[PDB]
Write a protein that binds this ligand. Structure first.
Ligand SMILES: CC/C=C\C/C=C\C/C=C\C/C=C/C/C=C/CCCCOC[C@H](COP(=O)(O)OCCN)OC(=O)CCCCCCCCCCCCCCCCC
Ligand SMILES: CC/C=C\C/C=C\C/C=C\C/C=C/C/C=C/CCCCOC[C@H](COP(=O)(O)OCCN)OC(=O)CCCCCCCCCCCCCCCCC
Ligand SMILES: CCOC(=O)NCCOc1ccc(Oc2ccccc2)cc1
Ligand SMILES: CCOC(=O)NCCOc1ccc(Oc2ccccc2)cc1
Lengths: 642, 642
């Protein structure tokens, strides 16, 4: 007895809709006999097969397949001593026919010498095309034959065929049945064909009719028609009463990405281009800001010409074209207007960003204001000033103008004296800013956001790759079919980590190279710890993919969950703005987020040069390691409750 | 003669080896007979059914079905005079049996009374559950029965069935075939049953065998056996040699979104919460910064106490505890240290942000510096200054510290003189900033990024909703099955635009109420024009969804394309940084992007109050309208060859 399913109970009930899929089964299959299984549309004939191979655990009862209980330490039924053909196609579209044959042969530990011979024989027998056409390029009716040949490659002693001939030309169905009846001539192998239409399953040695979760007929077809006095079987049925499984599986993972150009460009060429636009468009100070200057001491000749000519040594001549000489030539463009009202009108129409309006007697009232000193009069104070009207609608441009206009005066003051034999330190404010402890006197916004996007690109791209890989391949039956071949769920997960890790050290090597070596983002700290932190953040991201691909079955559902949780963090992690600006009731909450405490640690390791032994640099390692454990605990808990 | 396809011809594929699929098909069906087509591949026969219905087009071949032709307005087949049952389940999820029956009846313009009567009859006859179970909750074998019942509602004169009895028990096939032979008793109706297993082609009236795209046998079953002298058809086969359609289409659209909680939260509850975090975390100036002040005029007692007391009116007492009194109490917290070196290493350890270090003789030297004036000996200049060491690693925080310290000295100077009978105007730099034309002297970053988040939330959510709705519907066969029901492509497009417009009009009033009314973002312009511009961006976003769904056939491919184009555009449209910072060459290209010109128009309409008749404002309407036309041109061009 190859299979005994005596007294098989199985319930899918909910105490509201009790689905008694398997009420009481008494099935027995003898070695060397083809055993058909006819019934309804997968009412109980599609879960009994899964329970035979150990995919689904049985309820109270008995089971005995080949050696003993399925899925035990014998390696009886989940192994190389079985052949499984699923109801649907469970092949890889990006693989050649020969590539698929070798990949499945390596799982069973078959040498490449005999695999080629078996492949050639199978190709000749099943009139398939040459062994160079991809499975995705074959029609839907001839990849079923490829799957059938895959199930027949290793010639096991127990075949579980599920609809082996449904869309097959009967001319090449007579040959299939001849082969099936020939291989079972001796008492070596056995075939279990659970088809759907009765009329073809008549050459089998034994058949079984299944209805309402119970086999109501077991005997041979001839002692069925003779017993029930029937001219056909249809009228009978009218009964109203371990290192080889990781080398050969990593190659598949590294090939399903190379063949898909769209996936390759998304996870390798987007990070490269995104960090190029960011380093070129965000952070740099505005340049080329126009200014409408009114000079009442010179002669108005044109729009972009004033004939600014003063004297240098002493005897201050004009003191208005001299100040404009000290103006910064980088981020200020000067255009001249004839009237104070005309200049203001230009600003109101968006043709400029401000006005200056040096008065008619600025030189006379300025030299007489710094001479008298602290006993001046309101007349000279109100006629020796530059009246600036500014368009302060933009914070970042209203600050550059408000700073370059005052810095240019300090150089002007330090030039007027100093050329008149005086002490330059006299023209200063008592608030003297010494050399900064960290950074430089001219900081950049790019250096503040660059650490914030290193950990964002790496984290998100790991979630997208892991979630899609484990959802598409699970929903297509690739996990279930490969499990029957003996691939325990210990190297399926281990290989994915290795594949994810390798594709991950290549993303870090491109983001860091294109932002530190090129575009010159300062890295004052150790580059050794920067790489480790970036890699560790991603491993937290990959672990998040397991959580996403454990509660969502549909492809579209994981996208909303991934996007609906990422966006909200990243307005709380302080990537684009300092963390200090948030109110101190939500700052505490925002501290326990994934990326918030690692971004701060990476920022302090680049813009300050701190080491690991600093309570702000190692807090970013503990925070990103705890989340790895938390994400690996929720995923296990989810699978337990499902 | 209901169907005549004499001299049919069809071919497509590669130029070198075209796939001839309907080479010399000669098929003829007479009214009142159950024609039965038997094939092997299952793909060369389905195309014949599609050509018969009218979905496909022949290649130099005569056809005549029902009146004159499929697809014409004279005697067209697609409508209420044909019944289609697709190969796959083309039903709607989250729809009750009764609801889908009513919807498909309304498509055919049938009154509710007859719809209910036919629903009751079909429910009783086909052995289905009560008319309140959602279709997505039914088993695999019951959805097919529901689809068959749907195809039997309007009792037309031609039934194009495709494997209707495949997974039902024999006790039901007998009743189904009895009903099928009863309905075509008189010469009223016709049935074309294209099954796949040759056992139910015995109650038929004219069997047609199909192989290699030809009809090698078209002749009645019994006389076929008599002619070929056998006893089974299997042995014979071994012979190798318009307002009603928009109301129903709109109720369906608003129900497929209300029944899905996940979809509703993503397009309605996401932007409401997104604009709440943004208004609370990004834009606000940092507060709570700490300073390590060293005072050598008082006595060091603790870390948070110095006993700062001085003289108010005249007779300057300390002039160091007085300057600290003018410091801003909001964004600066004061901590005291005993030594200048003990307060500098505090900065190096991250415990503070700066130091002040008022010297021991600050008061005497300060009052002796402003008294002499311009003839001060250099020793007094170097002993009456506040030496500030700043942590300038952060650009944003370092700006406030450099500003709140210098601005506090202006108040200190204006308080020193003014209490000593002097004009405060004496302590002023000649660069005097008048009242700003725009900006109100207090710019905020959150007021610069808020225009541009409205157009980003609306644009992206329109792309995701439209692209993911036309891809799922089309790939499931829902669009094709509704087309056979007479629903023209112009009504599918019009019904989707109306639904999208209502959705984008409901998620626009939420991002505006929650950001302009609640969080007080200034709106100096007209609110009427802002609404139109935001809506115009939604239409532009939706029109981009048509382009993506016209070139992407897989769900996972549209996600990469949508994310692979929105990310670079958002980083080049100047949303989080002024466009003036970009290089001149890259700035020119950026202006041609969809959101680059629209964001600038909205920003000038909120922070400046400009009207429509301004070149900086109406340029955003022309830019966003050209893209609507451009996106509607590429989509039509894509469908030209597809
Ligand atoms: C003023 C208001 C303020 C804010 C608004 C409020 C609340 C919203 C806040 C954000 C809105 C949106 C989120 C976007 C969501 C769309 C959710 C619906 C998609 C999926 O949920 C349908 C699925 C998958 O579908 P599936 O199982 O495969 O269906 C089988 C049938 N074929 O299934 C199921 O039901 C199961 C249910 C799962 C749903 C989330 C389970 C949560 C557990 C842990 C998740 C996160 C853990 C911690 C995060 C760490 C932070 C980085
Ligand atoms: C804000 C946005 C608005 C305007 C922006 C601008 C321009 C838009 C005007 C039109 C938009 C586009 C037309 C695009 C294409 C029409 C043919 C293409 C797809 C047709 O299809 C092909 C397959 C699928 O077909 P296929 O692979 O060939 O067949 C086998 C099926 N598996 O599509 C896919 O998957 C695509 C998968 C993602 C590909 C890109 C993702 C991210 C790439 C980042 C850029 C990297 C490029 C190099 C840059 C180097 C660094 C500087
Ligand atoms: C070895 C694996 O190779 C594959 O064949 N992987 C295919 C998956 O590729 C995708 C990439 C991005 C994407 O989009 C998002 C975005 C957010 C959340 C989730 C998905 C979906 C799929
Ligand atoms: C008419 C009612 O619609 C539905 O019944 N549900 C589908 C809408 O929900 C989705 C949400 C996100 C998503 O992901 C993306 C993202 C970018 C591009 C394309 C798809 C796809 C679909």
């Amino acid at each position: 007895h190859a299979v005994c399913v005596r007294h098989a109970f199985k319930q899918y009930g909910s105490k509201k809709n009790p689905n008694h899929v398997l009420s009481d089964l008494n099935m027995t299959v003898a070695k060397g006999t083809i055993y058909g299984l006819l019934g309804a549309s997968g009412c109980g004939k599609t879960t009994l097969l899964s329970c035979i191979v150990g995919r689904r655990r049985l309820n109270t009862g008995e089971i005995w397949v080949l050696g003993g209980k399925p899925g035990t330490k014998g390696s009886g039924v989940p192994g190389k001593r079985v052949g499984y053909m699923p109801q649907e196609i469970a092949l890889y579209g990006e693989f050649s026919i020969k590539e698929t044959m070798m990949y499945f042969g390596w799982i069973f530990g078959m040498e490449s010498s005999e695999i080629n011979e078996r492949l050639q024989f199978l190709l000749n027998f099943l009139d398939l095309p040459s062994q160079n056409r991809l499975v995705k390029n074959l029609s839907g009716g001839q990849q079923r034959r490829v799957s059938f040949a895959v199930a027949l490659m290793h010639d096991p002693e127990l075949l579980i065929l599920d609809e082996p001939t449904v869309g097959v030309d009967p001319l090449l169905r007579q040959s299939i049945w001849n082969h099936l009846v020939q291989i079972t001539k001796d008492g070596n192998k056995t075939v279990i064909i659970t088809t759907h239409y009765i009329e073809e399953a008549r050459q089998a040695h034994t058949i079984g009719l299944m209805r309402s979760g119970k086999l109501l007929a077991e005997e041979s077809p001839h002692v069925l028609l003779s017993m029930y006095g029937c001219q056909s079987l249809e009228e009978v049925f009218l009964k109203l009463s371990s290192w080889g499984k990781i080398k050969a599986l990593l190659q598949k993972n590294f090939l399903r990405m190379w063949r898909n150009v769209g996936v390759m460009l998304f996870i390798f060429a987007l990070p490269v281009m995104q960090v190029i636009l960011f380093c070129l468009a965000i952070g740099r100070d505005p340049t080329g800001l126009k200014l409408a200057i009114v000079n009442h001491e010179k002669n108005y000749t044109n729009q972009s010409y004033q004939e600014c000519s003063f004297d240098y040594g002493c005897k201050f001549s004009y003191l208005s074209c001299r100040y404009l000489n000290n103006l910064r030539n980088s981020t200020i463009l000067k255009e001249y207007y004839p009237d104070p009202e005309s200049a203001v009108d230009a600003v109101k129409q968006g043709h400029a960003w401000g006005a200056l309006y040096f008065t008619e007697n600025f030189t006379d009232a300025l030299v007489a204001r710094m001479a008298l000193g602290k006993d001046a009069d309101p007349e000279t104070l109100d006629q020796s000033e530059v009246r600036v009207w500014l368009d302060m609608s933009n914070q970042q441009i209203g600050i550059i103008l408000q700073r370059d206009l005052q810095l240019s005066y300090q150089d002007f003051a330090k030039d007027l004296l100093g050329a008149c034999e005086q002490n330059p330190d006299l023209a200063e404010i008592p608030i003297s800013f010494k050399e900064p402890i960290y950074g430089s006197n001219k900081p950049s916004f790019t250096d503040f956001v660059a650490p914030g996007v290193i950990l964002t690109i790496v984290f998100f791209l790991a979630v997208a790759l892991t979630s899609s890989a484990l959802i598409i391949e699970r929903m297509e039956g690739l996990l279930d079919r490969s499990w029957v071949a003996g691939v325990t769920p210990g190297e399926i997960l281990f290989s994915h980590v290795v594949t994810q890790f390798v594709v991950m050290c290549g993303q870090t090597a491109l983001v860091l190279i294109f932002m530190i070596l090129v575009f010159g983002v300062q890295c004052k700290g150790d580059i050794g710890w920067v790489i480790v932190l970036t890699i560790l953040q991603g491993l937290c991201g990959m672990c998040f993919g397991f959580v996403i691909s454990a509660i969502c079955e549909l492809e579209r559902n994981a996208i909303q969950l991934a996007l609906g949780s990422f966006y909200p963090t990243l307005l709380l992690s302080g990537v684009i703005w300092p963390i200090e600006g948030m109110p101190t009731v939500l700052r505490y909450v925002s501290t326990f987020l994934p990326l918030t405490l690692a971004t701060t640690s990476l920022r302090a390791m680049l813009t300050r040069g701190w080491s690991i032994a600093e309570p702000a640099v190692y807090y970013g390692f503990l925070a990103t390691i705890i989340w790895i454990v938390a994400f690996l605990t929720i995923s296990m808990l989810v699978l337990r409750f499902k």
